[PDB]
């Protein structure tokens with residue numbers, strides 16, 4: 001938890017958060033997307049219309065070819081590459097250098113984003129979902145094994161021609177107490193592959209969705225910084241929109257809005273936040289029958305793009321995804337050592353005069369264990 005790591009993240013709305021890193025010798029500078037939703041460290045290693053610079057292996061005296069191809073398909077978008085290792089540093093991170101696995105991207109499809117300003121991706125999740133297989137040690141594992149950095153990192157993602165710029169902090173090796181107020185509440189990491197958690201209850205403006213909690217985690221629920229929106233399984237999505245639509249029936253928007261396709265604008269400064277409800281996601285606590293909740297304001301699920309916004313909540317077919325817009329306003333601790341994820345109100349907390357994002361507990365909930373999907 002260093003003051004030198006504060007504000008070491010940057011990016012544009014809808015295009016994620018990236019941290020500056022150097023690879024090879026001499027140091028090659030690159031902006032790398034911080035993604036707790038995957039486990040491969042990869043960087044553009046060949047020219048591309050959206051890349052202004054890229055990893056040039058031939059210019060690195062410390063590069064070692066692993067002579068193995070690698071391929072990684074995401075929800076939408078994918079890339080192909082060549083494996084190898086090299087020295088990697090995070091200028092605004094811990095003062096150490098480690099030899100890490102790196103997937104030099106040679107071919108890609110709908111992966112890189114035009115104008116995003118990042119040239120690679122840092123999969124911070126576990127080896128289990130790493131490609132080719134789990135023998136390809138993820139970056140953070142190498143960092144912990146090679147240096148004395150504590151097996152833990154925390155993220156503070158903040159809100160907002162060109163798309164609004166965003167800032168944040170990735171504290172490697174610790175917790176920076178000045179980045180949050182109040183208490184930290186932890187939810188167990190159900191399994192060490194994605195950063196899987198369990199949602200046991202959901203409320204829209206204080207009203208219970210009243211669904212079997214297995215639906216909330218239908219398939220799985222993950223904390224994913226590499227994903228923008230709050231993604232919800234079909235049944236949960238529909239209940240959610242119906243509830244949100246009702247609360248804001250005072251005004252009407254085109255179906256494209258709710259489908260997160262087309263934006264919606266209001267006179268600059270007149271956004272009627274008060275008509276949109278708050279969303280409370282209750283997460284399993286560290287104790288049976290006990291949980292805590294994180295409340296999201298409309299300022300979070302209505303992403304800036306007159307003041308224009310897009311509905312940052314969309315239907316998923318691969319489970320719940322607590323994306324960036326959910327993480328924003330909260331200080332999130334990925335306590336790998338103790339297999340848990342802590343949440344707390346962020347210093348750049350979720351605004352508003354009558355309301356505010358919050359992290360509250362405890363709230364008793366029985367049989368939280370049957371909320372998960374049992375393989």
Ligand SMILES: CCCCCS(=O)(=O)C[C@@H](NC(=O)c1cccnc1)C(=O)N[C@@H](Cc1cc(F)cc(F)c1)[C@H](O)CNCc1cccc(CC)c1
Nearest residue numbers: 014015016037038073074075076077078110111226227228
């Ligand atoms: C951060 C910049 C914002 C980009 C806006 S986004 O549309 O929300 C990105 C999201 N896209 C969507 O969620 C999406 C996209 C289109 C339609 N519906 C949903 C997505 O796929 N995210 C990848 C990171 C990524 C970032 C990019 F910038 C471009 C890519 F290519 C990939 C996560 O790693 C996925 N974790 C779940 C997961 C799923 C499958 C396999 C794995 C094993 C690696 C893992």
